Amino acid sequence: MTSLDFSTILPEVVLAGYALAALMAGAYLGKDRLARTLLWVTVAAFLVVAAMVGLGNHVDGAAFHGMFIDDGFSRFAKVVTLVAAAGVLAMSADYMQRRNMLRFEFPIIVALAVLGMMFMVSAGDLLTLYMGLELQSLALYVVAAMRRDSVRSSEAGLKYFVLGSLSSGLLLYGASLVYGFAGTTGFEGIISTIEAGHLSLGVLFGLVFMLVGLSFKVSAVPFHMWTPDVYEGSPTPVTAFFATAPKVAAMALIARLVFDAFGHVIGDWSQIVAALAVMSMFLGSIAGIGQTNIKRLMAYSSIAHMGFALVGLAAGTAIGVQNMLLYMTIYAVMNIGTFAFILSMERDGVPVTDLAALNRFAWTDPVKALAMLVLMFSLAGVPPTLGFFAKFGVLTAAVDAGMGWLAVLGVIASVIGAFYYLRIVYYMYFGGESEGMTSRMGAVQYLALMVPALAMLVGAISMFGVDSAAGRAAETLVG
Amino acid sequence: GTINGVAMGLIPRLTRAAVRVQSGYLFHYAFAMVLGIVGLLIWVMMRGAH
Amino acid sequence: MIGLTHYLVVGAILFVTGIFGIFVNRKNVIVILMSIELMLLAVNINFVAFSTHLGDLAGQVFTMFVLTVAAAEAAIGLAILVVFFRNRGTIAVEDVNVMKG
Amino acid sequence: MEYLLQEYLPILVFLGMASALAIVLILAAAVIAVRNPDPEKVSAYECGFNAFDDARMKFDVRFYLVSILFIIFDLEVAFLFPWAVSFASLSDVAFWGMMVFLAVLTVGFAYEWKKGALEWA
Ligand SMILES: [Ca+2]
């Protein structure tokens, strides 16, 4: 550690320092009487750290013998993760208090998970990748199971823990093979050794194990079956978190690994990523048709959308990475909007999650249904929504790389998936006899629905430089 | 008959298979992950070392 | 003569055994926690084997951190199992099945 | 390796020797003492009256949480042994890095204590 190393990781130290101080403040000055105050200070902390990461002048570099990489790619990913995490906490604050779920440790656990994500996207070494991933994963298991009186929370944590641990073991086994072949954990050393003429079955086995281990975290098929059960079982605020911030961090990590460690064997891993993307797009679309629980529908929506994002990465190009980044940004915005509405659903003062509760909602609350309509067409990828332009970008990358067969399959699965988004619109606007679901939203939760919904249309006019920012970020990674 | 047979006969039939495979049993989900790795390893082996 | 391949073979056997324990167990979630520990032990055998045969300490450093996460995983795994047992009265794998579809 | 042969082979040899001594002591009575088992003799002891049940029932462990924290604290102390052995050669970062590491440990320990996790359920 030099003073230059410490400066590079300063945003991470600031977040880590806050988490420790918040833990002591909550323990010694009121415990749950500070729970509401700690949640909102955490939201400010996430935004402050994002400002440190994203604002001012930045010069790309590395710290700690290359184990930590501070480049434009990692800065793009961190900002989206932190802002998405801040959004989920802010919009869920009222819901958790009403449901007697706001422990003063919940904001802190989320903060340490985000800290793990920040080390994931800036990994320049296999050990940094692992420690960042495991700090995030352990925090995610806890919040999945934090509704103690719910057998479904306990089962969600149990399934996530067991399958997450299995994927982590596979990731470690591949990481051990890669280290044995290359003689080092640093990616700059690894990339120089993994090249066309020297790929033994052993090192190719290592890549497969690492890829499969990571593809679990983005719910790629057939490493996806945890997602529907965990999404259903966990508290809806925790489900909203799983759907936005970890997926962005995990998707960026996969791009970091395949380009900074396996960037000279693109041909080998591009085919595997494409096969994952195909299976995820069709299963997510087909399985989503059979869902009656809205939370469980969003899991299959999540799986299908990660398949599309993987199409951009399967391209193996700077444009593919640029468009994968924009896709994840737009996907996170859409999920924040949708889960803001899902949190509000309730009948007789208790939360409700079944799709039939939406019948004729458009004639109960016109503005909220109109927002939900824009989000469903945005998730379906239909113009003029910003969700369409996300799909357009990854499809552009695929065709640009001579993978039109992947683009054709991608758009076909989109048609199947469009059915269950259309069905939600059908229920709200011309559905069957209504059972009195009401949407309870405070000011913050209300803006968590409207602003993402407005962004789906305003973004169609101007992306406000985000598309250009993603291109610069992709260049620093791919080179 | 063809259009409805595909849109309303086939795709729902594939939906029911997908729902069935999501059995809810933890050991089945782990089996799927192991089948995925084993299948991918078979794919890598056929391409060979190179 | 014992070379690297000997240790990798032992690692592979323990690794497959630990993976096998997860997706064949039905009656006890604690035995799954034991299988996860077998799987991570197999990983450390690889890291130590590669480390000593290369003459490098990184693999041994990696092993120390795998133990750290293994300890944290066991603590959280048992804590999650405790809350399930309280809510269900059982820890059989076949009983972690309410959510499906 | 010489270090293995000179220092660790004796451990393996003595492990067998100590095992042989313990086994011979058990077999001494097994071969010499009179064996005369009957159903009352081999039944379970509960102070003269028959046991209500055997000892294969669930039992609440009121120190379960402390035992989970025992696992965590075990790994924390493990990082100190290489540090203590290397103490003479430590750099300034290596020294104060441990102090930061131990400070994070103490925050966790203060959280357990204040929460009440060290009191039995
Ligand atoms: Ca690169």
Residue of C nearest to A127 (CA): C62
What span, in angstroms and rounded, lies between the C-alpha atoms of B36 and A426?
37
Residues A92/A35, Cβ–Cβ less than 8 Å: no
Contact criterion met (CB below 8 Å) for A104 and A190: no
Rounded Cα distance, A442 and A79, in Å: 26
Tokens of A410: 């991608």
Distance, in Å, from the CA atom of A310 to the CA atom of A280, rounded to the nearest integer, reads 9
- Least CB–CB distance from B33: residue in A163, A208, A287: A163
Does any CB of chain C come closer than 8 Å to the CB of residue A227?
A: no
Q: What burial class does residue A304 get, using C-beta atoms within 10 Å of its C-beta: 0-12 exposed, 13-18 middle, 19+ buried?
A: buried
Residue owning tokens 């281990």: A213
The answer to whether A303 touches A283, Cβ cutoff 8 Å, is yes
Residue type for position A412 = I
Q: With b meaning 16 or more CB within 10 Å and e meaning fewer, what string describes A179-218?
A: bbbbbbbbbebbbeebeeeebeeebbbbbbbbbbbbbbbb
Number of Cβ within 10 Å of residue A383's Cβ equals 12
Contacts of A183 in chain C (CB under 8 A): 54, 56
C89 min Cα distance to partner chain A (Å): 10
Tracing tokens 């080179």 back to the chain, one arrives at: A479
Chain B partners within 8 Å of A166 (Cβ): 30, 33
Chain A and chain D share a number of CB contacts under 8 A equal to 14
Q: Are A103 and A156 in contact (CB under 8 A)?
A: no
List the single best residue of A136, A147, A162 to mutate versus C (max C Cβ within 10 A). Answer: A162
Q: Report the 10 Å Cβ neighbour count for A456.
A: 24
Residue D21: other Cβ atoms inside 10 A: 9
- Which residue in the set B12, B26, B50 is minimally distant from A162, CB to CB? B26
Chain C nearest-CA residue for D73? C71
Q: Classify residue C48 by burial, with Cβ atoms within 10 Å: 0-12, 13-18, 19+.
A: middle
Compute and round to an integer the Cα radius of gyration of chain A: 21
Residues linked to residue A346 through DSSP beta bridges, in sequence order: A351, A438
H or E element, residue C76: helix C58-88
Minimal CA separation from A200 to chain B, in Å: 5
Chain breaks in chain C (C to N over 2.5 A) after: none
- Measure CA of the first residue to CA of the last residue in chain C; give whole Å: 54
Distance A126 CA to ligand 1 centre (A): 15
């693999």: which residue's tokens? Answer: C59
Taking the C-alpha atoms of residue A430 and residue C98, their distance in angstroms, rounded to an integer, is 33
Q: Are chains A and D touching, using the cut-off of 8 Å on CB pairs and a minimum of 3 such pairs?
A: yes
Q: Chain D residue with minimal CA distance to C66?
A: D75
Name the β-bridge partners of A350.
Answer: A347
Q: Does the distance separating the beta carbons of C64 and D79 come in below 8 Å?
A: yes
User: Is A158 close to C54, i.e. CB distance below 8 A?
Assistant: no
Give the Cβ contact number of residue A136 at 10 Å. 24
How far, in Å, CA of D53 to CA of C58, rounded? 54
Q: What is the torsion angle, in degrees rounded to the nearest 10, for the CA atoms of residue A7, residue A10, residue A12 and residue A17? A: 130
A113 touches A88 (CB < 8 A):
no
Measure the CA–CA gap between A222 and A212, rounded to whole angstroms.
9
DSSP letter assigned to residue A350:
E
Cβ-proximal residues to D105 (8 Å cutoff; 6+ apart), any chain? D76
Q: Please report where in the chains the tokens 């609440």 appear, as a residue.
A: D60
What is the distance in angstroms between the CA of the first residue and the CA of the last residue of chain B?
50
Please give the backbone phi and psi of residue D72, each rounded to the nearest 5 degrees, phi first. Answer: -65, -50
C92: its two tokens: 């059989």
Q: Report chain C residues touching chain D, CB-CB < 8 A.
A: 64, 67-68, 71-72, 74-75, 78-79, 82
Picking from C30, D64, B23, B36, the residue whose alpha carbon sits closest to that of residue A162 is: C30
Nearest by CB to residue C75, choosing from D72, D78, D79, is: D72
SS3 for A293?
A: strand
Pick from C25, C98, C100: CB nearest B27: C25
C25 in contact with chain B, both atoms CB, cutoff 8 A: yes
Task: Residue D64: list chain C partners with CB under 8 A.
Answer: 82
Disruptive mutation site among C61, C99, C100 for chain A (greatest number of A CBs within 10 Å): C99
Tokens of A4: 């230059």
CB distance D111–A20 less than 8 Å?
no
Radius of gyration of chain B (CA): 17
Q: Does A12 touch chain C (CB under 8 A)?
A: no
The Cα–Cα gap between D66 and D60 comes to 14
Rounded alpha-carbon distances, angstroms, from residue A90 to A391, A442, A450 = 28, 11, 14
Contact criterion met (CB below 8 Å) for C49 and C8: yes
3-state secondary structure of A440: coil
Q: Which two tokens mark A321?
A: 């990475």
d(CA A164, CA A168): 6
- CA-nearest of A301, A303, A302, A327 to A313 is A327
Nearest-angstrom CA–CA distance, A367 and A372: 9
Identify which of A217, A377, A234 has the alpha carbon closest to the alpha carbon of residue A295.
Answer: A234
Cβ contacts of B14 on chain A, cutoff 8 Å: 286
Strands A438-439 and A345-347: antiparallel
Cα dist. A345→A29, A351, A377, A393, D75 in Å? Answer: 34, 6, 20, 33, 45
Angle between helices A366-380 and A404-430 (to 10 degrees): 160
Q: Which spans in A183-265 are helix H?
A: 187-193, 201-217, 226-233, 236-260
Please state, as a whole number, how many other Cβ atoms lie within 10 Å of the Cβ of residue D13: 10
Is A24–D93 a contact, with Cβ atoms under 8 angstroms apart?
Answer: no
Q: Measured between beta carbons, which residues in chain B are less than 8 angstroms from residue C96?
A: 26
Nearest chain A residue to D100 by CA: give it: A17
Cβ contact B40–A223 (<8 Å): no
On whether the CB atoms of residues C99 and A232 are closer than 8 A, the answer is: yes
Q: Which residues, at least 6 apart from A438, have a Cβ–Cβ distance to it below 8 Å?
A: A346, A347, A364
Distances (CA, A) of A356 to A231, A423, C57: 19, 10, 60
Q: Do D107 and A1 touch (CB under 8 A)?
A: no
Residues 29-48 of C with CB under 8 A from B: none
Cα separation, A421 vs A412, whole angstroms: 15
The backbone region for A333, taken as left when phi is positive above 0, alpha when psi lies in -120 to 50, beta otherwise, is: alpha
Inter-chain residue contact C93 with B34, CB threshold 8 Å? no
Closest by Cβ to C75, choosing from D68, D78, D79? D68
Q: Residue length, chain C?
A: 101
Q: Could you tell me the two tokens for A342?
A: 């899902």
DSSP A124-182: -BHHHHHHHHHHHHHHHHHHHT--TT-HHHHHHHHHHHHHHHHHHHHHHHHHHHHHHHH
C-beta separation of A408 from A341 below 8 A: no
H or E element in which residue C14 lies: helix C4-24
H/E element holding A68? strand A68-70
- Quick one: tokens of A138? 């352990």
Which of B18, C53, C83 lies closest to A291 in space, CA to CA? B18
Cα A347 to chain centroid distance, Å, stands at 30
Residue written as tokens 């109960």?
A364
Pick the residue from chain B with its C-alpha nearest to C27: B27
A70 closest CA partner among A128, A121, A2, A17: A121
Q: Measuring CA to CA, how many Å separate A243 from each of A58, A83, A99, A296, A339?
A: 30, 14, 21, 11, 9
Half-sphere exposure of C56 (CA within 13 A, CB side): 16
The answer to whether C97 and B25 have CB atoms below 8 angstroms apart is yes
CA distance A406 to A412: 10
**Token code pair at residue A86:** 């801040």
The answer to whether B and D touch (≥3 CB pairs < 8 Å) is: no
Token pair, residue D14, equals 């003595």
C-alpha dist (Å) from residue C100 to A229, A230, A243, B22: 7, 10, 19, 6
What backbone torsions phi and psi does residue D17 show, to the nearest 5 degrees?
A: -65, -45
Select from D28, D64, B18, C100 the least CA-distant residue to A159: C100
Structure tokens at A136: 């995030």
Q: Coil, strand or helix: which one is A231?
A: helix
Resolution value (Å, 1 decimal) = 2.3
Side chain identity at A399, as an amino acid letter?
A: V
Residue C53: closest C-alpha in chain A: A180
Each as own residue / partner, the long-range contacts of residues A404-409 (CB below 8 Å, 24 or more positions apart, any chain) are A406/A274, A406/A277, A406/A278, A406/A311, A406/A314, A407/A311, A409/A278, A409/A281, A409/A282
Identity of the residue numbered A458: V
The Cα A158–Cα A166 span in angstroms is 12
Amino acid at A237: P
Within an 8 Å CB–CB cutoff, is residue D117 touching chain A? no
Task: For residue A63, list its beta bridge partners.
Answer: A68
Q: How far apart are alpha carbons A425 and A109 in whole angstroms? A: 36
Beta-carbon neighbours within 5 Å of ion ligand 1:
A 260, 479
Contact C96, C31 (CB under 8 A): no
- The CA A259 to ligand 1 mean position distance, Å, reads 6
